[PDB]
Each structure stands twice: as C-alpha cells, then as structure tokens.
Amino acid sequence: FSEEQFWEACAELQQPALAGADWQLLVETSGISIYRLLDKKTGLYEYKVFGVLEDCSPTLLADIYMDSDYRKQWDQYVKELYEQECNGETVVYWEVKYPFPMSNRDYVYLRQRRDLDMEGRKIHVILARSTSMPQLGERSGVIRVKQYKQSLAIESDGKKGSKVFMYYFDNPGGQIPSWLINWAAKNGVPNFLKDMARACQNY
Numbered sequence: 001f002s003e004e005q006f007w008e009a010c011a012e013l014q015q016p017a018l019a020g021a022d023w024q025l026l027v028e029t030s031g032i033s034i035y036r037l038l039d040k041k042t043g044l045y046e047y048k049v050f051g052v053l054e055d056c057s058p059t060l061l062a063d064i065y066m067d068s069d070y071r072k073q074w075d076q077y078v079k080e081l082y083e084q085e086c087n088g089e090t091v092v093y094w095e096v097k098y099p100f101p102m103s104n105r106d107y108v109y110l111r112q113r114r115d116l117d118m119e120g121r122k123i124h125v126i127l128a129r130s131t132s133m134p135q136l137g138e139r140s141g142v143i144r145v146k147q148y149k150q151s152l153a154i155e156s157d158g159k160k161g162s163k164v165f166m167y168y169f170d171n172p173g174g175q176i177p178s179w180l181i182n183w184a185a186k187n188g189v190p191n192f193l194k195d196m197a198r199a200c201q202n203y
C-alpha cells in the first residue's frame, strides 16, 4: 500500500463515479446504498457503498473498524478473527459465517489505515489486500478466499454522523445463491448496520 492508493479511495467518497459501467442499486438503509457491477465473464461482482451514518463519530467508526477484540465480540458473523505482525505489516485472518450447508469463508489479508489531512479534513481511510503465509495455509471445511480487496473511506458529515464510501471485491471460491443475496440485501445488512450503530454508542 502506497500514498497513491489511500488518496484514491477518498475520491468516490467526495464523488460517486458510477457512470462508468452498468452499476446497479441493490439496497438503501440507515442512509446507505449498495451498488454492484457484474463482470459477465466471471459472474463475479464488484460492490460500491456510499451513505451516511449519523450517530457514528467518524473517529469512532474507524477505531471500531480496526478493533478485532471488540469486533469479534459483537459481530454475529465473525467465526474466527485475529491479527499478527508479519515483517512490518499487520496481517489479518478472518473467518466468515456462511449458512449451512455452505462452507464458511476465511481471509488472510494486509489491512492498513491512514488518517488524512486533505483540506484540513480528517478522512479516515483503510485498505485491504489478500496475501499469503507458509505457516497459515488453507483449512479443510472452510473456503480460503485468495482474491480480495476493499477500501473504506470515512469522513464527518458535519453533524453527528459520518459520510462514507467503500469499494469491495473478492472471489468467494463458490457460487453465491441469489437468495443469499436477497437475504443479505433485504435483511442481512440492514441488521448489521443496525447492530453496528448500537456497537458505536456502546463503545
């Protein structure tokens, strides 16, 4: 992760560049919308998120976003999660709860946050990249996602909450049934965002 990337993540934050290709809404909640672009060759998706979360100190959100011990503690979909220093960087292992029959999914990745000063504005930006480790090979039963990358941009909304932009993409190593998307969309996330807000006020 370079200087470059971090600032890049801040862009669509200011301005939602969706014109480009065939993006599509999918959800709107707590003041948040989720777009997605489908690579027709692979059938994979690209998600993009914008929105505002009043009641979430831009500063809190960011801290809460890196606090595993706590995140592990309140995020109903976290099966396993822990960090380790490998060389000079922080590598994260994360296991995600998938409805049985489906195998959970686990990620090994390089995470990095940087608080930016752009125009006298604190713009909390975090980056995520999939990486690998001899000592941390794949697991049986759990699907190791080897392609994954996300970036989240936090910022004050001026009032009580925080305006945010997020880019996501990973290859789940399996087909995601559309009902799952429907649940994710129609119930999954809404609740998550709900549980997370509760998670802020209680920090």
Ligand SMILES: CCCCC/C=C\C/C=C\CCCCCCCC(=O)O[C@H](COC(=O)CCCCCCCCCCCCCCC)COP(=O)([O-])OCC[N+](C)(C)C
Residues within 6 Å of the ligand: 026, 027, 032, 034, 047, 049, 061, 077, 094, 096, 097, 098, 107, 150, 152, 153, 154, 164, 166, 168, 176, 180, 181, 184, 185, 188, 189, 192, 193
């Ligand atoms: C500044 C705002 C902070 C974020 C809040 C706003 C939006 C986050 C929620 C949704 C973003 C959509 C793209 C991420 C999906 C990956 C799952 C995840 O991992 O979902 C969580 C939030 O759990 C949830 O929704 C609960 C849903 C879990 C069900 C699992 C199967 C989902 C199948 C596809 C979902 C279909 C799209 C949803 C329709 C809206 C965001 O993971 P994370 O970014 O906290 O770190 C993530 C680090 N891994 C990648 C290593 C985990």
